[PDB]
Every structure is written in C-alpha cells, then in structure tokens.
Tab-separated table of C-alpha atoms in Angstrom:
chain	number	residue	atom	x	y	z
H	1	UNK	CA	-41.218	-5.309	-18.565
H	2	UNK	CA	-38.872	-7.357	-20.749
H	3	UNK	CA	-35.654	-5.735	-19.467
H	4	UNK	CA	-34.062	-6.356	-16.059
H	5	UNK	CA	-33.301	-2.680	-15.566
H	6	UNK	CA	-31.822	-3.210	-12.093
H	7	UNK	CA	-29.281	-5.849	-13.124
H	8	UNK	CA	-28.207	-3.897	-16.202
H	9	UNK	CA	-27.907	-0.819	-13.998
H	10	UNK	CA	-25.586	-2.739	-11.686
H	11	UNK	CA	-23.513	-4.053	-14.596
H	12	UNK	CA	-23.144	-0.586	-16.125
H	13	UNK	CA	-22.209	0.858	-12.731
H	14	UNK	CA	-19.518	-1.772	-12.239
H	15	UNK	CA	-18.050	-1.415	-15.727
H	16	UNK	CA	-17.962	2.382	-15.661
H	17	UNK	CA	-16.379	2.336	-12.210
H	18	UNK	CA	-13.879	-0.156	-13.628
H	19	UNK	CA	-12.867	1.963	-16.621
H	20	UNK	CA	-13.373	5.604	-15.606
H	21	UNK	CA	-12.631	5.866	-11.893
H	22	UNK	CA	-10.399	2.805	-12.284
H	23	UNK	CA	-11.261	1.890	-8.706
H	24	UNK	CA	-9.458	-0.912	-6.908
H	25	UNK	CA	-12.129	-3.349	-8.124
H	26	UNK	CA	-10.614	-5.742	-10.657
H	27	UNK	CA	-12.588	-8.782	-11.814
H	28	UNK	CA	-13.112	-10.564	-15.108
H	29	UNK	CA	-15.585	-8.744	-17.355
H	30	UNK	CA	-17.416	-10.641	-20.087
H	31	UNK	CA	-19.169	-9.515	-23.271
H	32	UNK	CA	-22.414	-9.943	-21.333
H	33	UNK	CA	-21.487	-6.960	-19.163
H	34	UNK	CA	-20.674	-4.626	-22.056
H	35	UNK	CA	-23.832	-5.645	-23.921
H	36	UNK	CA	-25.931	-4.998	-20.814
H	37	UNK	CA	-24.223	-1.639	-20.295
H	38	UNK	CA	-24.772	-0.504	-23.882
H	39	UNK	CA	-28.419	-1.554	-23.702
H	40	UNK	CA	-28.762	0.322	-20.413
H	41	UNK	CA	-27.297	3.493	-21.917
H	42	UNK	CA	-29.461	3.264	-25.044
H	43	UNK	CA	-32.585	2.680	-22.950
H	44	UNK	CA	-32.081	5.775	-20.795
H	45	UNK	CA	-32.786	8.919	-22.801
H	46	UNK	CA	-30.636	10.875	-20.340
H	47	UNK	CA	-27.675	8.731	-21.388
H	48	UNK	CA	-28.240	9.050	-25.137
H	49	UNK	CA	-25.279	11.443	-25.258
H	50	UNK	CA	-22.969	8.806	-23.776
H	51	UNK	CA	-24.503	6.199	-26.073
H	52	UNK	CA	-23.815	8.344	-29.136
H	53	UNK	CA	-20.261	9.010	-27.946
H	54	UNK	CA	-19.554	5.299	-27.578
H	55	UNK	CA	-21.172	4.500	-30.931
H	56	UNK	CA	-19.124	7.148	-32.744
H	57	UNK	CA	-15.829	5.438	-31.897
H	58	UNK	CA	-16.834	2.252	-33.753
H	59	UNK	CA	-15.664	3.614	-37.106
H	60	UNK	CA	-12.798	5.906	-36.062
H	61	UNK	CA	-11.301	5.166	-32.638
H	62	UNK	CA	-8.381	7.598	-32.970
H	63	UNK	CA	-9.789	10.965	-31.923
H	64	UNK	CA	-11.475	12.934	-29.196
H	65	UNK	CA	-14.950	13.895	-30.460
H	66	UNK	CA	-15.768	17.559	-30.889
H	67	UNK	CA	-18.598	18.805	-28.681
H	68	UNK	CA	-20.018	22.016	-27.235
H	69	UNK	CA	-19.683	23.375	-23.719
H	70	UNK	CA	-23.357	22.687	-22.971
H	71	UNK	CA	-22.971	19.162	-24.346
H	72	UNK	CA	-19.987	18.636	-22.049
H	73	UNK	CA	-21.963	19.935	-19.069
H	74	UNK	CA	-24.887	17.620	-19.802
H	75	UNK	CA	-22.502	14.698	-20.290
H	76	UNK	CA	-20.833	15.392	-16.946
H	77	UNK	CA	-24.239	15.593	-15.282
H	78	UNK	CA	-25.309	12.273	-16.805
H	79	UNK	CA	-22.098	10.515	-15.772
H	80	UNK	CA	-22.237	11.953	-12.253
H	81	UNK	CA	-25.879	10.939	-11.832
H	82	UNK	CA	-25.096	7.434	-13.072
H	83	UNK	CA	-22.087	7.009	-10.778
H	84	UNK	CA	-23.826	8.736	-7.836
H	85	UNK	CA	-20.489	10.244	-6.764
H	86	UNK	CA	-20.819	14.037	-6.865
H	87	UNK	CA	-17.747	14.218	-4.646
H	88	UNK	CA	-15.200	13.330	-7.316
H	89	UNK	CA	-13.252	14.951	-10.143
H	90	UNK	CA	-14.564	13.604	-13.452
H	91	UNK	CA	-14.099	16.719	-15.564
H	92	UNK	CA	-12.378	15.695	-18.787
H	93	UNK	CA	-9.646	13.108	-18.174
H	94	UNK	CA	-12.274	10.598	-17.066
H	95	UNK	CA	-14.205	10.965	-20.321
H	96	UNK	CA	-11.083	10.678	-22.476
H	97	UNK	CA	-9.985	7.547	-20.611
H	98	UNK	CA	-13.438	6.011	-21.057
H	99	UNK	CA	-13.405	6.765	-24.778
H	100	UNK	CA	-9.937	5.254	-25.138
H	101	UNK	CA	-10.892	2.097	-23.244
H	102	UNK	CA	-14.093	1.564	-25.212
H	103	UNK	CA	-12.237	2.286	-28.453
H	104	UNK	CA	-9.810	-0.479	-27.543
H	105	UNK	CA	-12.556	-2.897	-26.493
H	106	UNK	CA	-14.973	-2.452	-29.399
H	107	UNK	CA	-12.184	-2.551	-31.972
H	108	UNK	CA	-10.703	-5.571	-30.258
H	109	UNK	CA	-11.389	-9.120	-31.445
H	110	UNK	CA	-12.583	-12.023	-29.320
H	111	UNK	CA	-10.056	-13.603	-26.966
H	112	UNK	CA	-10.128	-16.774	-24.898
H	113	UNK	CA	-8.178	-15.365	-21.918
H	114	UNK	CA	-8.401	-11.575	-21.588
H	115	UNK	CA	-5.897	-9.083	-22.955
H	116	UNK	CA	-4.498	-7.303	-19.864
H	117	UNK	CA	-3.301	-4.136	-21.612
H	118	UNK	CA	-2.416	-0.862	-19.929
H	119	UNK	CA	-4.701	2.137	-20.400
H	120	UNK	CA	-1.790	4.088	-21.884
H	121	UNK	CA	-3.380	4.488	-25.288
H	122	UNK	CA	-4.869	7.147	-27.572
H	123	UNK	CA	-3.475	10.187	-25.798
H	124	UNK	CA	-4.726	13.634	-26.738
H	125	UNK	CA	-3.104	16.892	-27.914
H	126	UNK	CA	-1.556	15.063	-30.914
H	127	UNK	CA	1.829	15.891	-29.381
H	128	UNK	CA	4.895	13.859	-30.276
H	129	UNK	CA	5.812	11.406	-27.537
H	130	UNK	CA	8.041	13.177	-25.029
H	131	UNK	CA	10.792	11.965	-22.726
H	132	UNK	CA	10.889	12.093	-18.944
H	133	UNK	CA	13.917	14.394	-18.836
H	134	UNK	CA	12.550	16.969	-21.286
H	135	UNK	CA	9.143	17.294	-19.636
H	136	UNK	CA	10.665	17.144	-16.154
H	137	UNK	CA	13.081	19.986	-16.916
H	138	UNK	CA	10.386	22.061	-18.614
H	139	UNK	CA	7.957	21.669	-15.717
H	140	UNK	CA	10.573	22.161	-13.005
H	141	UNK	CA	11.434	25.459	-14.665
H	142	UNK	CA	7.874	26.561	-13.912
H	143	UNK	CA	8.008	25.018	-10.433
H	144	UNK	CA	11.260	26.738	-9.475
H	145	UNK	CA	9.910	30.154	-10.483
H	146	UNK	CA	8.508	31.665	-7.265
H	147	UNK	CA	5.701	31.520	-4.675
H	148	UNK	CA	6.378	29.629	-1.455
H	149	UNK	CA	3.518	29.633	1.034
H	150	UNK	CA	4.702	29.011	4.620
H	151	UNK	CA	7.967	29.753	6.442
H	152	UNK	CA	8.478	27.219	9.255
H	153	UNK	CA	12.003	27.849	10.521
H	154	UNK	CA	12.773	26.758	14.093
H	155	UNK	CA	11.222	23.312	13.836
H	156	UNK	CA	9.358	21.681	16.701
H	157	UNK	CA	9.849	17.991	17.424
H	158	UNK	CA	7.142	15.960	15.729
H	159	UNK	CA	4.327	15.749	18.295
H	160	UNK	CA	3.163	12.419	19.662
H	161	UNK	CA	0.078	11.544	21.680
H	162	UNK	CA	1.219	10.557	25.164
H	163	UNK	CA	-2.020	8.862	26.245
H	164	UNK	CA	-1.896	5.082	25.909
H	165	UNK	CA	-5.684	4.677	25.927
H	166	UNK	CA	-5.895	6.924	22.865
H	167	UNK	CA	-3.548	4.385	21.250
H	168	UNK	CA	-5.093	1.170	22.583
H	169	UNK	CA	-8.569	2.189	21.419
H	170	UNK	CA	-7.148	2.962	17.976
H	171	UNK	CA	-5.444	-0.437	17.912
H	172	UNK	CA	-8.728	-2.128	18.801
H	173	UNK	CA	-10.691	-0.221	16.154
H	174	UNK	CA	-8.091	-0.760	13.433
H	175	UNK	CA	-7.212	-4.394	14.219
H	176	UNK	CA	-10.103	-6.080	12.317
H	177	UNK	CA	-8.977	-4.412	9.092
H	178	UNK	CA	-7.121	-6.977	6.949
H	179	UNK	CA	-3.643	-5.711	6.138
H	180	UNK	CA	-3.560	-7.297	2.680
H	181	UNK	CA	-6.619	-5.367	1.518
H	182	UNK	CA	-5.161	-2.064	2.723
H	183	UNK	CA	-1.797	-2.648	1.057
H	184	UNK	CA	-3.393	-3.805	-2.193
H	185	UNK	CA	-5.714	-0.798	-2.317
H	186	UNK	CA	-2.923	1.691	-1.625
H	187	UNK	CA	-0.571	0.153	-4.177
H	188	UNK	CA	-3.186	-0.038	-6.928
H	189	UNK	CA	-4.166	3.539	-6.161
H	190	UNK	CA	-0.635	4.865	-6.528
H	191	UNK	CA	-0.313	2.879	-9.749
H	192	UNK	CA	-3.506	4.294	-11.260
H	193	UNK	CA	-2.644	7.852	-10.258
H	194	UNK	CA	0.775	7.545	-11.874
H	195	UNK	CA	-0.756	5.994	-14.990
H	196	UNK	CA	-3.302	8.781	-15.411
H	197	UNK	CA	-0.792	11.570	-14.807
H	198	UNK	CA	1.605	9.966	-17.272
H	199	UNK	CA	-1.056	9.428	-19.937
H	200	UNK	CA	-2.156	13.058	-19.722
H	201	UNK	CA	1.513	14.055	-19.836
H	202	UNK	CA	1.701	12.396	-23.295
H	203	UNK	CA	5.019	10.631	-22.668
H	204	UNK	CA	6.218	7.021	-22.908
H	205	UNK	CA	5.878	5.101	-19.645
H	206	UNK	CA	7.867	2.121	-18.406
H	207	UNK	CA	5.266	-0.647	-18.417
H	208	UNK	CA	7.069	-3.161	-16.200
H	209	UNK	CA	10.329	-1.318	-15.562
H	210	UNK	CA	10.090	1.851	-13.468
H	211	UNK	CA	7.541	0.747	-10.873
H	212	UNK	CA	8.847	-2.809	-11.209
H	213	UNK	CA	12.485	-1.793	-10.744
H	214	UNK	CA	11.451	0.401	-7.804
H	215	UNK	CA	9.800	-2.580	-6.123
H	216	UNK	CA	12.817	-4.754	-6.923
H	217	UNK	CA	15.191	-2.177	-5.441
H	218	UNK	CA	13.170	-1.970	-2.237
H	219	UNK	CA	13.029	-5.752	-1.872
H	220	UNK	CA	16.742	-6.211	-2.585
H	221	UNK	CA	17.936	-3.412	-0.304
H	222	UNK	CA	15.729	-4.617	2.546
H	223	UNK	CA	16.708	-8.260	2.020
H	224	UNK	CA	20.393	-8.219	1.049
R	1	UNK	CA	17.277	-33.666	5.031
R	2	UNK	CA	13.479	-33.601	5.048
R	3	UNK	CA	13.204	-35.301	8.445
R	4	UNK	CA	15.332	-35.472	11.589
R	5	UNK	CA	15.798	-38.655	13.624
R	6	UNK	CA	16.397	-38.593	17.382
R	7	UNK	CA	17.802	-41.619	19.216
R	8	UNK	CA	18.318	-41.734	22.979
R	9	UNK	CA	21.597	-43.281	24.131
R	10	UNK	CA	20.673	-45.221	27.266
R	11	UNK	CA	23.624	-46.446	29.316
R	12	UNK	CA	23.992	-50.232	29.664
R	13	UNK	CA	21.047	-51.357	27.533
R	14	UNK	CA	19.997	-52.063	23.954
R	15	UNK	CA	16.365	-50.948	23.887
R	16	UNK	CA	16.187	-47.513	22.268
R	17	UNK	CA	13.745	-44.849	21.151
R	18	UNK	CA	14.195	-43.890	17.498
R	19	UNK	CA	11.807	-40.993	16.965
R	20	UNK	CA	11.789	-39.130	13.651
R	21	UNK	CA	10.602	-35.535	13.366
R	22	UNK	CA	9.987	-33.088	10.538
R	23	UNK	CA	11.183	-29.531	10.093
R	24	UNK	CA	7.936	-28.536	8.359
R	25	UNK	CA	5.986	-27.865	11.566
R	26	UNK	CA	8.806	-25.738	12.969
R	27	UNK	CA	9.027	-23.807	9.702
R	28	UNK	CA	5.270	-23.192	9.775
R	29	UNK	CA	5.379	-21.926	13.359
R	30	UNK	CA	8.358	-19.700	12.522
R	31	UNK	CA	6.517	-18.220	9.541
R	32	UNK	CA	3.360	-17.661	11.592
R	33	UNK	CA	5.255	-15.919	14.390
R	34	UNK	CA	7.165	-13.736	11.933
R	35	UNK	CA	4.004	-12.714	10.083
R	36	UNK	CA	2.237	-11.886	13.347
R	37	UNK	CA	5.151	-9.729	14.499
R	38	UNK	CA	5.307	-7.895	11.169
R	39	UNK	CA	1.557	-7.261	11.264
R	40	UNK	CA	1.848	-5.893	14.796
R	41	UNK	CA	4.705	-3.601	13.748
R	42	UNK	CA	2.723	-2.271	10.782
R	43	UNK	CA	-0.379	-1.628	12.880
R	44	UNK	CA	1.711	0.099	15.556
R	45	UNK	CA	3.275	2.381	12.944
R	46	UNK	CA	-0.138	3.261	11.519
R	47	UNK	CA	-1.506	3.946	15.006
R	48	UNK	CA	1.427	6.247	15.771
R	49	UNK	CA	0.855	8.160	12.545
R	50	UNK	CA	-2.884	8.525	13.121
R	51	UNK	CA	-2.371	9.677	16.713
R	52	UNK	CA	0.152	12.304	15.616
R	53	UNK	CA	-2.188	13.611	12.918
R	54	UNK	CA	-4.939	13.718	15.544
R	55	UNK	CA	-2.686	15.789	17.798
R	56	UNK	CA	-2.327	18.282	14.933
R	57	UNK	CA	-5.576	19.848	16.354
R	58	UNK	CA	-7.444	19.758	13.021
R	59	UNK	CA	-11.243	19.875	12.943
R	60	UNK	CA	-12.010	18.500	9.496
R	61	UNK	CA	-11.606	15.019	7.995
R	62	UNK	CA	-8.356	14.310	6.196
R	63	UNK	CA	-9.786	14.007	2.686
R	64	UNK	CA	-11.855	17.150	3.234
R	65	UNK	CA	-8.661	18.934	4.269
R	66	UNK	CA	-6.940	17.802	1.090
R	67	UNK	CA	-9.899	19.032	-0.974
R	68	UNK	CA	-9.672	22.591	0.421
R	69	UNK	CA	-7.491	24.287	-2.173
R	70	UNK	CA	-8.425	27.648	-0.629
R	71	UNK	CA	-6.123	27.059	2.357
R	72	UNK	CA	-2.677	25.510	1.925
R	73	UNK	CA	-1.559	25.918	5.552
R	74	UNK	CA	-3.170	22.650	6.655
R	75	UNK	CA	-1.755	20.655	3.731
R	76	UNK	CA	1.745	21.968	4.401
R	77	UNK	CA	1.379	21.084	8.079
R	78	UNK	CA	0.279	17.527	7.297
R	79	UNK	CA	3.059	16.914	4.775
R	80	UNK	CA	5.676	18.344	7.135
R	81	UNK	CA	4.450	16.142	9.974
R	82	UNK	CA	4.536	13.009	7.825
R	83	UNK	CA	8.054	13.748	6.571
R	84	UNK	CA	9.197	14.295	10.152
R	85	UNK	CA	7.594	10.980	11.085
R	86	UNK	CA	9.518	9.132	8.385
R	87	UNK	CA	12.738	10.829	9.480
R	88	UNK	CA	12.048	9.696	13.041
R	89	UNK	CA	11.418	6.153	11.821
R	90	UNK	CA	14.796	5.984	10.085
R	91	UNK	CA	16.799	7.856	12.745
R	92	UNK	CA	15.034	7.700	16.124
R	93	UNK	CA	17.739	9.787	17.805
R	94	UNK	CA	16.966	12.957	15.819
R	95	UNK	CA	13.433	14.302	15.401
R	96	UNK	CA	13.311	17.884	14.101
R	97	UNK	CA	15.012	19.372	11.037
R	98	UNK	CA	17.931	21.787	10.996
R	99	UNK	CA	16.701	23.779	8.005
R	100	UNK	CA	13.428	25.509	7.160
R	101	UNK	CA	11.121	24.154	4.467
R	102	UNK	CA	9.028	26.398	2.244
R	103	UNK	CA	5.878	24.621	1.094
R	104	UNK	CA	4.245	25.334	-2.267
R	105	UNK	CA	0.953	23.794	-3.380
R	106	UNK	CA	0.414	23.430	-7.119
R	107	UNK	CA	-2.937	23.104	-8.885
R	108	UNK	CA	-2.169	22.629	-12.575
R	109	UNK	CA	-0.909	19.994	-14.978
R	110	UNK	CA	2.167	22.067	-15.851
R	111	UNK	CA	3.507	21.828	-12.314
R	112	UNK	CA	2.530	18.145	-12.144
R	113	UNK	CA	5.626	15.961	-12.381
R	114	UNK	CA	4.591	12.928	-14.451
R	115	UNK	CA	4.230	10.406	-11.661
R	116	UNK	CA	6.273	11.592	-8.695
R	117	UNK	CA	3.761	13.753	-6.802
R	118	UNK	CA	5.710	15.055	-3.793
R	119	UNK	CA	8.538	16.801	-5.596
R	120	UNK	CA	11.315	17.570	-3.118
R	121	UNK	CA	13.771	20.332	-4.025
R	122	UNK	CA	16.183	22.832	-2.496
R	123	UNK	CA	17.450	26.219	-3.655
R	124	UNK	CA	20.133	28.412	-2.062
R	125	UNK	CA	20.531	26.153	0.962
R	126	UNK	CA	16.814	25.993	1.818
R	127	UNK	CA	14.626	22.937	1.289
R	128	UNK	CA	11.488	23.344	-0.826
R	129	UNK	CA	8.464	21.033	-0.767
R	130	UNK	CA	6.380	21.016	-3.951
R	131	UNK	CA	3.004	19.276	-3.846
R	132	UNK	CA	0.418	18.231	-6.453
R	133	UNK	CA	-2.834	18.467	-4.514
R	134	UNK	CA	-5.046	17.360	-7.466
R	135	UNK	CA	-3.076	14.117	-7.771
R	136	UNK	CA	-3.376	13.583	-4.019
R	137	UNK	CA	-7.137	14.073	-4.204
R	138	UNK	CA	-7.396	11.729	-7.184
R	139	UNK	CA	-5.526	8.960	-5.393
R	140	UNK	CA	-7.436	9.505	-2.148
R	141	UNK	CA	-10.778	9.387	-3.993
R	142	UNK	CA	-10.671	6.186	-6.056
R	143	UNK	CA	-13.391	4.266	-4.161
R	144	UNK	CA	-11.071	1.743	-2.551
R	145	UNK	CA	-12.445	-1.781	-2.727
R	146	UNK	CA	-13.565	-3.040	0.676
R	147	UNK	CA	-14.941	-6.482	-0.213
R	148	UNK	CA	-13.063	-9.423	1.298
R	149	UNK	CA	-10.823	-10.524	-1.594
R	150	UNK	CA	-7.617	-11.821	-0.009
R	151	UNK	CA	-5.716	-12.535	-3.249
R	152	UNK	CA	-2.485	-13.213	-1.341
R	153	UNK	CA	-1.851	-16.298	-3.536
R	154	UNK	CA	1.875	-17.179	-3.312
R	155	UNK	CA	-16.879	5.530	19.207
R	156	UNK	CA	-14.209	6.377	16.655
R	157	UNK	CA	-15.172	7.144	13.062
R	158	UNK	CA	-12.391	5.393	11.150
R	159	UNK	CA	-13.488	3.177	8.275
R	160	UNK	CA	-11.329	0.984	6.057
R	161	UNK	CA	-11.636	3.564	3.261
R	162	UNK	CA	-9.907	5.934	5.696
R	163	UNK	CA	-7.107	3.740	7.038
R	164	UNK	CA	-6.348	2.932	3.408
R	165	UNK	CA	-5.918	6.622	2.584
R	166	UNK	CA	-3.695	7.139	5.624
R	167	UNK	CA	-1.502	4.240	4.501
R	168	UNK	CA	-1.408	5.625	0.957
R	169	UNK	CA	-0.197	8.967	2.289
R	170	UNK	CA	2.461	7.108	4.256
R	171	UNK	CA	3.627	5.271	1.129
R	172	UNK	CA	3.746	8.358	-1.090
R	173	UNK	CA	5.613	10.390	1.520
R	174	UNK	CA	7.911	7.383	1.936
R	175	UNK	CA	8.894	7.410	-1.730
R	176	UNK	CA	9.404	11.164	-1.456
R	177	UNK	CA	11.613	10.698	1.606
R	178	UNK	CA	13.715	8.075	-0.164
R	179	UNK	CA	14.324	10.467	-3.044
R	180	UNK	CA	15.155	13.256	-0.589
R	181	UNK	CA	17.604	11.027	1.285
R	182	UNK	CA	19.301	10.181	-2.006
R	183	UNK	CA	19.523	13.915	-2.714
R	184	UNK	CA	21.050	14.616	0.695
R	185	UNK	CA	23.565	11.755	0.710
R	186	UNK	CA	24.955	12.645	-2.736
R	187	UNK	CA	25.019	15.427	-5.297
R	188	UNK	CA	22.147	17.063	-7.129
R	189	UNK	CA	23.176	15.097	-10.215
R	190	UNK	CA	22.584	11.854	-8.323
R	191	UNK	CA	19.100	12.976	-7.306
R	192	UNK	CA	18.249	14.000	-10.872
R	193	UNK	CA	19.481	10.689	-12.274
R	194	UNK	CA	17.658	8.671	-9.607
R	195	UNK	CA	14.400	10.512	-10.309
R	196	UNK	CA	14.420	8.964	-13.779
R	197	UNK	CA	15.483	5.490	-12.582
R	198	UNK	CA	14.590	4.690	-8.943
R	199	UNK	CA	17.369	2.097	-9.395
R	200	UNK	CA	19.990	3.726	-7.149
R	201	UNK	CA	18.288	3.073	-3.800
R	202	UNK	CA	20.637	0.079	-3.431
R	203	UNK	CA	23.534	2.382	-2.498
R	204	UNK	CA	23.573	1.857	1.275
R	205	UNK	CA	19.898	1.525	2.282
R	206	UNK	CA	20.481	-2.065	3.392
R	207	UNK	CA	21.141	-2.791	7.057
R	208	UNK	CA	24.129	-0.552	7.800
R	209	UNK	CA	25.437	1.919	10.360
R	210	UNK	CA	24.243	4.845	8.235
R	211	UNK	CA	20.995	3.107	7.166
R	212	UNK	CA	19.415	1.166	10.030
R	213	UNK	CA	17.002	-1.736	9.654
R	214	UNK	CA	13.341	-0.886	9.130
R	215	UNK	CA	10.248	-2.406	7.570
R	216	UNK	CA	9.924	0.762	5.425
R	217	UNK	CA	6.173	0.031	5.028
R	218	UNK	CA	6.834	-1.733	1.715
R	219	UNK	CA	8.827	-4.888	2.507
R	220	UNK	CA	5.823	-6.271	4.405
R	221	UNK	CA	4.667	-7.875	1.151
R	222	UNK	CA	6.332	-8.695	-2.136
R	223	UNK	CA	4.372	-7.357	-5.099
R	224	UNK	CA	4.721	-6.973	-8.850
R	225	UNK	CA	2.839	-6.243	-12.053
R	226	UNK	CA	1.645	-9.280	-14.015
R	227	UNK	CA	2.471	-8.018	-17.500
R	228	UNK	CA	3.971	-10.455	-19.990
X	1	UNK	CA	9.089	-9.456	41.707
X	2	UNK	CA	6.257	-11.593	43.051
X	3	UNK	CA	7.019	-13.975	45.936
X	4	UNK	CA	9.156	-13.473	49.041
X	5	UNK	CA	11.017	-16.315	50.765
X	6	UNK	CA	13.835	-15.045	52.985
X	7	UNK	CA	15.054	-17.723	55.405
X	8	UNK	CA	15.323	-21.007	53.520
X	9	UNK	CA	14.085	-24.146	55.253
X	10	UNK	CA	15.435	-27.680	55.066
X	11	UNK	CA	13.590	-29.807	52.525
X	12	UNK	CA	11.147	-32.220	54.215
X	13	UNK	CA	11.551	-35.938	53.592
X	14	UNK	CA	8.748	-38.447	54.077
X	15	UNK	CA	10.834	-40.770	56.247
X	16	UNK	CA	8.011	-43.346	56.381
X	17	UNK	CA	9.433	-46.502	54.814
X	18	UNK	CA	5.902	-47.850	54.277
X	19	UNK	CA	4.938	-45.071	51.857
X	20	UNK	CA	8.266	-45.296	50.015
X	21	UNK	CA	7.994	-49.075	49.601
X	22	UNK	CA	4.423	-48.674	48.349
X	23	UNK	CA	5.519	-46.113	45.759
X	24	UNK	CA	8.481	-48.258	44.695
X	25	UNK	CA	6.131	-51.184	44.099
X	26	UNK	CA	3.763	-48.862	42.221
X	27	UNK	CA	6.501	-47.722	39.833
X	28	UNK	CA	8.254	-51.105	39.474
X	29	UNK	CA	5.941	-52.317	36.646
X	30	UNK	CA	6.653	-49.086	34.762
X	31	UNK	CA	9.596	-49.621	32.360
X	32	UNK	CA	12.226	-47.001	33.163
X	33	UNK	CA	13.748	-46.903	29.670
X	34	UNK	CA	10.499	-45.734	28.076
X	35	UNK	CA	10.132	-42.931	30.623
X	36	UNK	CA	13.699	-41.745	30.023
X	37	UNK	CA	13.001	-41.744	26.283
X	38	UNK	CA	9.747	-39.789	26.602
X	39	UNK	CA	11.300	-37.203	28.909
X	40	UNK	CA	14.196	-36.688	26.500
X	41	UNK	CA	11.907	-36.215	23.507
X	42	UNK	CA	9.511	-34.000	25.462
X	43	UNK	CA	12.223	-31.584	26.563
X	44	UNK	CA	13.719	-31.682	23.060
X	45	UNK	CA	10.458	-30.896	21.258
X	46	UNK	CA	9.489	-28.148	23.696
X	47	UNK	CA	12.929	-26.560	23.368
X	48	UNK	CA	12.859	-26.655	19.569
X	49	UNK	CA	9.329	-25.245	19.400
X	50	UNK	CA	10.123	-22.364	21.759
X	51	UNK	CA	13.338	-21.699	19.830
X	52	UNK	CA	11.403	-21.564	16.560
C-alpha cells in the first residue's frame, strides 16, 4: 500500500500517550507527527468518531461537544483499543484534556521553538474561576461530615524485616535502577496529577509559584 | 587560588622541589564520594520501606491493592505504615503514635482537595486521615517512562515501574507529613495558611534540635519547572 | 582483632658490615634531596586525597 500504517500507528500512539495519559515521556513533537496521527485516525473507520471530534474543534475550540451515551461508549472503546491499556481510567477527563490540547494546537500558529504551555486551558462547567480557599472550605465541609472506616487505637511500632538477606537481595535487585529516572518519573507524575485535579476543579493554579515555592522551601530549609 | 604550590624546605641546601597542584581533582573526588553516599542512603531508605510493606503480610500487588475500592482496610494500613515510617525517619527515638487515627477513603471529586491528595485533619483531639484513592490510582498509573534518558544536565518481581510507584508514594506521604508536622507544631490557623502557600516550611525544619538533619527524599536533586 | 604478638622480641640487625657497605654504595648514586622531596609530596597527596 501507499501508507506506512505501522509508523503512523506508532506516531499516533506516542502523541495520544503524550496528551491524554500525559505519561512521563516528553520529547519534541513536530507537525509530521500530528499529520501522521490525523491521517491514521481518518484511515481507520473505527476511529472516525475521534477524527470527527478533532475536526469539529477547528472552527470553535471553546466547548465540549455534545454527544450521546452510546457515542461516548464507542469513543471510549476506540481510545482504549488504540492505547491498548484497558487497565486505566480514561472515562471523561482524558477526552476533555485531549480536546483542549488539540484545540490549542490546531488553532496555534507556527513557531520556531515550541510553545511550552500548561494544559490548564478550556475548563468545563462554564463556572467562574474559583479560589483555593473557597473550594477548599466548601469541600472540607463535605469531608468533615462523617464516616471514618477503621479505629486503630493502641498503635504497634512500625514493623521492620529483621532478615538481612531479605534486604541484601532487594538491594541487589534495585541497584541497577538509575536514581535520576525514578526521581524524574515520580516528580512529573505528582505534577501531572496535581494539574489534572486542579483543571477539573476549575480554579486558577500557580504556574511557577506553588510547586516552585515548595521546591524552593525544601531546598532552602535543607541547605541553610 | 586556582592552584596550590608545595615547596619542600630542605635543611642546608638550595635545591628544592616546587610542585604545583590543583584543587579540581580533589573537588571532583569529593563530589563523587558525596553523590555515592547520597545514592546509597536513598536506596537504603527505599529498601527499608519495601521490606516493611512486604512484612505487612499482603497478598496482592501494591497497585492492585490501591485499585480495590471495595476494601479500604488495606489502603488505610499502607498509609498508616508509611506515615509511621516518615515519623521514624525524622525522630528515630519514637516509633508509634500516641493518638488513634480514623481513616476515610474518598471516591469523588467533591472530596478531592485540588492538589493535596493526603488531606490530614483532626477533630475533637483525634487525628483523621482523608485519602483520595482515584488520584492515587491516576498517579500510580501514568505509564512511567523507562527508557534511558538521563537528562541530569546541570527471583523478585520488582520492575522499575514498581520502584517508581513506591518512591512516588513516599514523596506524597512526605508532603502530607510535612503539612501534618506544621499543624502539630503550631495552631490550626498556621496549618490552614500553609496549605495555601507551602512557604512556611522554613520555620525550623533546618538542622536543629527539634528538626534533625535528613535527606527528606527531596534534597537529593534540585529541580524546577522551566516556564518563562 | 586479627594478630597476636605477646612477648616482644628485640629487633634483629644485620651486623654484617659487608652487606651494609654494599647497600651504602648502591644508594650513594641516588640523590637524597630528590627522595626527600618525593616522599614529602607522596605523603601530602595521599593525605589530601583521603581527607577529600
């Protein structure tokens, strides 16, 4: 055939993992990748729903599209089959994030060196932007209502494995792991989780203040 | 000075050795030794945590446990153990806790605090531990990159995608413990204000009698966002 | 603890003047000043490296 289906499959997989799951992967993505992905979606009849969704945002990029329950189910099935990750939560927030990101990209002009913009954009519910204190108080009110679940009172010292071999084997198994990769993954993961929760919360985040000041505080207190 | 000169004073002579040395090699060896020691400390801490969790006598994998909304007993046990571990790390003398903690697992956006997952509260003299399990699952299930991309710039079934999740749990519980310590050391107002800032950790957390020295699992590497 | 030595014996000396004269002639070409200098720098560098 005239289409490298495998390579376009790989490109679409990478881009969707980059935008939707927002996995730790972070590399430069060029117009080639988006073109390949759109062609891949258009080619597959199964993915015509996703293709139509992406196309719709070209004109108006400021709204969640209206669908039916069956349409949503089929869309979830198509996305799950594409990603080949049934063991994940991709219910609705994933789709909204993807629509927002593609709305930004398609309605963005050409740039020489990236844009590097946070995915805090085009939130839903059309709610006025809310403050941390207001939402925190409102939600804590619900939290403080009732319903604990376990009553551990006396308190036993935190157990520790006394066998050294059980520790030396673990050290041997875990040693080859590079520490930098682990730290980078964990940090990026916390960042993305906070970003998604905040975006759904429909509030105004601190781009380079709250997490940044937290890091600064840790470094200063440990150092000086 | 960049370089250091050593001259030997030989008695009753004029011939001398005048050997010049650099500090750069010594600095490099110092940095290498320090980095090795820090890496060993971090790996030892992770091994301790994993061994403790293993001693919890749990059959299922960690992520599977965190996916089982049906039972909250296991999640409460894990969170309690990790908090106790952090408390031991700060204050090795004391291990257990005086009070009792009631654990509540939450499974909705309304309970979800926008960003701080492990909400730590107290009411009527009893500590309460609120948890957002969906956020925990989301963070634990983000397909952590495993490819060798250093980017430092300036028998057992334990894969990297598992050690990473264990470390992430350590970090999240660590932030929770810092907020709880702020709550304990001061008034409720201080805790509420700090929740919205994170800028009050500089109170006494530096090397002090009340706050001992520790790596804290986050000073091992400086990091920051690259926004303009 | 590894090795046990309890009594303490007098240090042996090779009283043979022939061997001592031979060794003295062997070392006579060697300039003493250079050896003193090298020993000083060697101890110095080892000490600084271990201290680092």
